[PDB]
DNA sequence: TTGGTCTGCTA
DNA sequence: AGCAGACCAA
C-alpha cells in the first residue's frame, strides 16, 4: 500500500494525487466530474444542488440528519446515470493511463 | 468546501 | 478489496 502519484490527464490539467490502494477511488471520481459540464449531483430531499459524490453526501449529514437512508454508492453511478457512458468516459480520459489504477496491479 | 491522510468491516 | 466515514488543515 505505497504511495503513488496519481495525474489527472483530461486536457490542459495539471492536477496530481497522492493515493493508495487502500483510499479506494472517491476522491478521483469526484476530480473526473469536474470536468464534465453540466453534470450536477441534486439533493432528493431539497432544491440543493452541488457537483460531487462527496459534496451531496455532506450535504446530506449536515442538512438532513433525520433520513438515515444513505446516498448512493459509488459503484452505482455509471450504470443508473442517464449520461453514464459520459461518466466513464471522462473516468478514462482523466486516469485510465494510471496502470496502478488498475485492480490487482 | 477540498486536500492530505487514515482505517474497520457486510473480514 | 476498497468503500466510505473519519480527522485536521487551508
Ligand atoms: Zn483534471
Ligand atoms: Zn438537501
Same mark, same amino acid.
Given at each position: 500500500?505505497?504511495? @503513488?502519484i496519481?495525474? *489527472? &490527464?483530461?486536457?490542459? *490539467? $495539471?492536477?496530481?494525487? $497522492?493515493? !493508495?490502494?487502500?483510499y479506494?477511488?472517491?476522491?478521483? +471520481?469526484? &476530480?473526473?466530474?469536474? @470536468?464534465?459540464? /453540466?453534470?450536477? %449531483?441534486? *439533493? $432528493?430531499?431539497?432544491?440543493? %444542488?452541488?457537483?460531487?459524490? !462527496? $459534496?451531496?453526501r455532506? @450535504? /446530506?449529514?449536515?442538512? &438532513?440528519?433525520?433520513?438515515?437512508?444513505?446516498?448512493?454508492?459509488?459503484?452505482? +453511478? +455509471?450504470?443508473?446515470?442517464?449520461?453514464?457512458?459520459?461518466?466513464?468516459? +471522462?473516468?478514462?480520459? *482523466?486516469?485510465?493511463?494510471? !496502470?496502478?489504477?488498475? @485492480?490487482?496491479?
Amino acid at each position: 500500500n505505497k504511495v @503513488h502519484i496519481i495525474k *489527472c &490527464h483530461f486536457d490542459k *490539467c $495539471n492536477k496530481s494525487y $497522492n493515493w !493508495r490502494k487502500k483510499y479506494g477511488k472517491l476522491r478521483l +471520481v469526484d &476530480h473526473a466530474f469536474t @470536468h464534465v459540464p /453540466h453534470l450536477k %449531483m441534486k *439533493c $432528493n430531499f431539497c432544491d440543493y %444542488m452541488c457537483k460531487g459524490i !462527496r $459534496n451531496i453526501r455532506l @450535504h /446530506h449529514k449536515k442538512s &438532513h440528519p433525520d433520513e438515515q437512508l444513505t446516498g448512493f454508492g459509488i459503484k452505482s +453511478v +455509471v450504470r443508473t446515470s442517464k449520461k453514464g457512458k459520459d461518466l466513464a468516459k +471522462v473516468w478514462d480520459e *482523466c486516469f485510465k493511463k494510471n !496502470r496502478v489504477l488498475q @485492480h490487482g496491479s
